[PDB]
């Protein structure tokens, strides 16, 4: 099991910028036969990985000349000379010298933009849902940048783990921001035993958590 470590995991760039991505193997990629079987792949959303580079530095037919691979032994580099829109995706390196064949974790190529704090909205359970014996508390954290963010659920000031469902959007085409959905699901019984429900988000944009709260009794 050769370990392919890929760096960085996310690479913000502006269109026309040059980008470089690295890959390290645990063991040497040099096959007894003399070949170095290291491949570079690009996966655009909704499609399958397509190889760009094979055997370190051979560019597959039809791949733009703006892509080039280099390295030897256990250190490999992928280089894009002028980032275009159609270049955005996830890039993987993979070795095929040793069984089992293995892959790196991916590097996402995304647009660079100014930091923007999340706009947080909190939503108590709807009447229709309580009527069913369930109570879902929802929090939207919209249009923020960078993507990194932590969300904490607090009930009567104590932290709640269990029953949280998080979902994230992909970088927005228009503005380059990300959005996130955090839903805490409780039983109607539980929701009626507690009063204070809070959504607290930690983001680089601010030193202190972004808090959004509601009191059930005040509903």
């Amino acid at each position: 099991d050769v370990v392919m470590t890929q760096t960085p995991l996310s690479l913000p760039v502006s269109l026309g910028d040059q980008a470089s991505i690295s890959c390290r193997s645990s063991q040497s990629l040099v096959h007894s036969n003399g070949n170095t079987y290291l491949r570079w792949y690009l996966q655009k959303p909704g499609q399958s990985p397509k190889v760009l580079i094979y055997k370190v530095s051979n560019r597959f037919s039809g791949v733009p000349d703006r892509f080039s691979g280099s390295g030897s032994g256990t250190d490999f580099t992928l280089k894009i000379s002028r980032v275009e829109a159609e270049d955005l995706g996830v890039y993987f390196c993979s070795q095929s010298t040793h069984v089992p064949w293995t892959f790196g974790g991916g590097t996402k190529l995304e647009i660079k933009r100014a930091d923007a704090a999340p706009t947080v909205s909190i939503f108590p359970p709807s009447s229709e849902q309580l009527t069913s014996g369930g109570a879902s508390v929802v929090c939207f954290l919209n249009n923020f940048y960078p993507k990194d963010i932590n969300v904490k659920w607090k009930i009567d000031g104590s932290e709640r783990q269990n029953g949280v469902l998080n979902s994230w959007t992909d970088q927005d085409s228009k503005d380059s921001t990300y959005s996130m959905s955090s839903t805490l699901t409780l039983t109607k019984d539980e929701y009626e035993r507690h009063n204070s429900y809070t959504c607290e988000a930690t983001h680089k944009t601010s030193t202190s958590p972004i808090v959004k709260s509601f009191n059930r009794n005040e509903c």
């Binding site: 089992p100 359970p125 939207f140 005040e218």
Partner: protein, 216 residues
Amino acid sequence: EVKLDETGGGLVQPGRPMKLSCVASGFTFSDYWMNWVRQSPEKGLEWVAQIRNKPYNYETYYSDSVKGRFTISRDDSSVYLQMNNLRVEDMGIYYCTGSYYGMDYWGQGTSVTVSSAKTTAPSVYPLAPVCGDTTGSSVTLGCLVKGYFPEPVTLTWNSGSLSSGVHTFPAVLQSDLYTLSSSVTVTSSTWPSQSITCNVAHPASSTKVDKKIEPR
């Protein structure tokens, strides 16, 4: 002009098996090594199994994790993968690859869903701004689509007239059933002055719901 087109995916109750078929269509099938690779719900690309050729005495290799349960085979044209004893952890997208002198060609992929769940219609709920209080210039509304199965729901805002300011979050599997949510940001001029309706479809259970967002 290398072509790989896999087939044979769907739902599978765990413990149960399934058979994946890939017909390699634009090369000397005999000269290439064939492979099965899968991609898990996240960032996890995984090499599953390998079937070599004559020269390499049709050796067969398999990843730790499917060893004794899956069989790669070839029809010198096509390659098959017999998936037996399907667990949840084997849920992912499955791609067929043709390998040759360092190069690799991938097909389209086939999704393999492993779940006990049966077809269940979603519960759609209106998400109105806070317990009759503070919100409204520009107000944010939402719609919650809870516990449906399988895979596909469609959510629209005002029958698709209102497209801007909406965010639709990818569905996530909450212990055998999916949940989806969507937000729409309007202006205080607009709501509740106007009508804001969440439209949801779940073709598989024949559901078509329209939920109006009313001031809570």
